């Protein structure tokens, strides 16, 4: 295989059918002042039985595009 | 069809060719795949720097040499070596 990309994030909202949206925070150094800045990005993952709720810590992996703006799936729910 | 051809890179009056494998649908001295050898027809011996470790590899992969390419690869080897099955 090839071990497609994987991210770890926090569930932000569950208001859709069989789909969740999580937010991932990363600390990147500023290109000029060299100060580490917390930048956020929101992914859209795929859920089957609607198990995770807002405030959890999930781990998603990149797959084929299952829909528009939806190319991830939750596999490794860690904390609730 | 990937072909083994020559790319002109010298100066005005004195040419200097690179024996390189490239796609036929590309410009002469532009994009290529992998530089193979080097040809300098500025001295009497007509110096060459062929690389028989990749020439036969490209020939097996499906390269198609031209007249000058197959005349440079003639008196430097890799043709009597590509023939051996």
């Amino acid at each position: 295989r090839n071990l497609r990309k994987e991210r770890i994030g926090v569930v932000t909202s569950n208001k859709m059918d069989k789909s969740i949206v999580i937010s991932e925070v990363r600390k990147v150094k500023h290109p000029l002042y060299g100060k580490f800045v917390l930048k956020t990005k929101k992914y859209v993952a795929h859920d089957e039985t609607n198990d995770c709720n807002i405030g959890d810590t999930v781990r998603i992996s990149e797959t084929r595009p299952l829909s528009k703006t939806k190319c991830w799936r939750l596999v490794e729910i860690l904390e609730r | 069809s990937v072909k083994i051809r020559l790319q002109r890179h010298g100066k005005k009056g004195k040419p200097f060719y690179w024996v390189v494998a490239a796609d036929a649908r590309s410009k002469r001295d532009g994009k290529y795949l992998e530089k193979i050898g080097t040809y300098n027809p500025n001295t009497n011996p007509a110096t060459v720097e062929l690389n028989l470790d990749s020439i036969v590899k490209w020939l097996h992969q499906g390269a198609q040499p031209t007249d000058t390419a197959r005349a440079i690869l003639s008196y430097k080897g890799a043709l009597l070596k590509h023939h051996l099955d």
Partner: protein
């Protein structure tokens, strides 16, 4: 100041407003004159400087200063403005090339011949 303040809003760099603006950022511009007259400096100089109202090819009305002595510069003449203001006439911010299409050069000039458009005697 603070690194956090700089990260939020960095240093603002100004644009350095140019000097010669009404010539479209070209070295020379052709133009036609409409009024050739004379003006006074501010102080304490006392003279009669020769200026001309030139309408450039890009639709700009400027005031050019005629260098040297000796010229025709009628009410309608094709001149070539190059730029370079003077600190005596308020408003004149351009110069006219001597030796251009229609403007005359100078006679009896021998030292600064490259300027004022004078041939070598």
């Amino acid at each position: 100041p603070t690194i956090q303040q700089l990260v939020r809003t960095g240093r603002t760099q100004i644009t350095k407003k140019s000097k010669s603006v009404a010539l479209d950022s070209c070295p020379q511009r052709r133009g036609v004159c409409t009024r050739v007259y004379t003006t006074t400096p501010k102080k304490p100089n006392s003279a009669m400087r020769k200026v001309a109202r030139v309408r450039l090819t890009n639709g700009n009305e400027v005031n050019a200063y005629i260098p040297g002595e000796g010229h025709n510069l009628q009410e309608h003449s094709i001149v070539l403005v190059r730029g370079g203001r003077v600190k005596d006439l308020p408003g004149v911010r351009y110069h006219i090339v001597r030796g251009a299409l229609d403007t005359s050069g100078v006679a009896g000039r021998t030292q600064r011949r490259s300027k004022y458009g004078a041939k070598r005697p």
